[PDB]
Design a protein around this nucleic acid. Structure first.
Lengths: 45, 44
DNA sequence: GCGGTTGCACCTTTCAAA
DNA sequence: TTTGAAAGGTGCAACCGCA
C-alpha cells in the first residue's frame, strides 16, 4: 500500500511549510507532486 | 534523514515504475524529483 | 551514510454496515 | 445510533550495494 522516500530534514521542513500554506497535509503534497510529475513524463513526446 | 511513506495504489506504483524505466532512474529518484519540482512550482 | 527499498505500526478522519 | 474498517497520514528500523 506504500512506497517510501528518504528525505533530509530541510526538505521535510519545506514540505511542511508549503503544505500548511495550501491547507493540505505533507502526505497529500507528496502525492500531488508525484501525479504532477508523472503527467509531465506521460504527456512528453 | 528519514523515510517518509506515501500511500499509493497499484496503478500509480506501476505508472511510476514505467516512467522511471523510460527516464533511466529509480522509482525512488522519480518521487524525490517530483517533490523538488512541485516545491519549486509552489514557491515560485 | 546515502540512495534505494521494504515493511511495518501507530495515528486521525470519514462514513456505511450492522 | 454505534463502531470499526477504510482512507488518509506519519515516520521508525533495517536490509542492500556502494564509495
Amino acid at each position: 500500500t506504500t512506497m517510501g522516500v528518504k528525505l533530509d530534514d530541510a526538505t521535510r521542513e519545506r514540505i511542511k511549510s508549503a503544505a500548511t500554506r495550501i491547507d493540505r497535509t505533507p502526505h497529500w503534497l507528496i502525492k500531488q507532486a508525484i501525479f504532477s510529475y508523472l503527467e509531465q513524463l506521460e504527456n512528453s513526446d
